[PDB]
């Protein structure tokens, strides 16, 4: 591949240089480089084409350069709207193109927020098949790391559990979810279950019980 730094960070209103280092037979030999912006779960957006040019409607805040076998993107006037993975690509010898390994741009100093936790019991439609699950949904939080644990009758549960790696929403805050998977006897065994989520040392807890 072309080589990029795995991640880079910058404060609001600042400017950042994102770099892609290839070899002489791709970045060097040809004045054909481009940059793409990718928000998660969405298609890449073209940001610069050739070493220098911008598509229509791409903001004046983006510019491109090349020196020797290396090329770079400048983003200036950082908004949180600029938080994305950024990919470089260049034409390569005899009718190819090559991508760089990608780089994740973190825009620092955004307002923190602790999770809007929601919790639901098994459906009565579900436990009629004598299998039962608890659904805990974790929404609108930043920064994006969470500790999360379940309890049965106020005591900790360490089997039958799965939890997502967190995911960025449209609004740059994070979502996640946790699931507890039970038989109907194991649902009925306990008069309440709780999902406990801890974010920046502050704790949100949500509680559920039969009927």
């Amino acid at each position: 591949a072309l080589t990029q730094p795995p991640s880079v960070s910058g404060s609001p209103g600042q400017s950042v240089i994102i770099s892609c280092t290839g070899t002489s037979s791709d970045i060097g030999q040809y004045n054909s480089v481009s940059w793409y912006q990718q928000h998660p779960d969405k298609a890449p957006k073209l940001v610069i084409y050739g070493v220098t040019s911008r598509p229509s409607g791409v903001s004046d805040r983006f510019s491109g350069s090349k020196y020797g076998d290396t090329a770079s993107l400048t983003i200036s006037g950082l908004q949180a709207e600029d938080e994305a993975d950024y990919y470089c690509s260049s034409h390569a010898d005899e009718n190819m193109a090559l991508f760089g390994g990608g780089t994740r741009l973190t825009v620092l100093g955004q307002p923190k927020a602790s999770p809007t936790v929601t919790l639901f019991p098994p459906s009565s439609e579900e436990l009629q098949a004598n299998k039962a699950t608890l659904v805990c949904l974790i929404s609108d939080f930043y920064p994006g790391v969470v500790k999360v644990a379940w309890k049965a009758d106020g005591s900790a549960v360490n089997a039958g559990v799965e939890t997502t790696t967190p995911s960025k929403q449209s609004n740059n805050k994070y979502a996640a979810s946790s699931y507890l998977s039970l038989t109907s006897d194991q649902w009925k065994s306990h008069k309440s279950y709780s999902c406990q989520v801890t974010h920046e040392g502050s704790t949100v807890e949500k509680t559920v019980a039969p009927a």
Partner: protein
């Protein structure tokens, strides 16, 4: 407008062929546009696969995938296609189609229009359709939801009241179980006075199994 959209099987078995089409709107497939395929192995970065030159029908691929696939253009349907033989687990990725903007040298490097992407999964496993259950309030304050259990492969798509709802809807990323089957959940935040005054239903579609279903969150 110029629009592209991917089509193809969501599941492929090891050492089959994986095929995809990209249907082109608003421009002729013959307009000379470097009709390009790109993949993104999930959370592992972009790969360029290759292109078709619209007005000559010549094609070229990535030196890993030439000698194993072709790309072609269909003049009758106004679309282009990737055929990628001897499929392996590594070929599991989101596949995108794209347009190289007109008349650049190496325009397949400078891709102005992109398609939505289609996840293709390579597995010896079987497709399995979802089990769909409603989630209903008293026990979370204003949110309805739905649960979509133990399906394969990815993805499943969800909507509320047949697309009458968009505001206040949020569908969560799935989680992989140890069984290799996935599950996910969807919610909609409802103005609490509306419960039983307005009907709430979720539409669900796991197309790799042809499973389309609708479910009543019956208050």
């Amino acid at each position: 407008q110029v629009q592209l959209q991917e089509s193809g099987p969501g599941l492929v078995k090891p050492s089959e062929t994986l095929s995809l089409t990209c249907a082109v709107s608003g421009v002729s497939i013959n307009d000379g546009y470097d009709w390009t395929w790109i993949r993104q192995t999930p959370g592992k970065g972009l790969e360029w696969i290759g292109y078709v030159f619209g007005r000559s029908g010549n094609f070229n691929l990535n030196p890993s995938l030439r000698n194993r696939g072709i790309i072609s253009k269909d003049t009758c349907k106004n679309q282009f296609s990737l055929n990628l033989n001897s499929a392996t687990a590594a070929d599991t990725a989101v596949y995108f189609c794209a347009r190289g903007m007109e008349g650049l040298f190496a325009a397949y490097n400078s891709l102005d229009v992109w398609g939505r992407g289609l996840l293709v999964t390579v597995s010896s496993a079987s497709t399995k359709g979802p089990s769909v259950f409603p989630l209903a309030p008293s026990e979370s304050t204003a949110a309805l939801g739905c649960l979509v259990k133990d399906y394969f492969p990815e993805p499943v798509t969800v909507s509320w009241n047949s697309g009458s709802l968009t505001s206040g809807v949020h569908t969560f990323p799935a989680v992989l179980q140890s069984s290799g089957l996935y599950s996910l959940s969807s919610v909609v935040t409802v103005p609490s006075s509306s419960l039983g005054t307005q009907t709430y239903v979720c539409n669900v579609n796991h197309k790799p199994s042809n499973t389309k279903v609708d479910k009543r969150v019956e208050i």
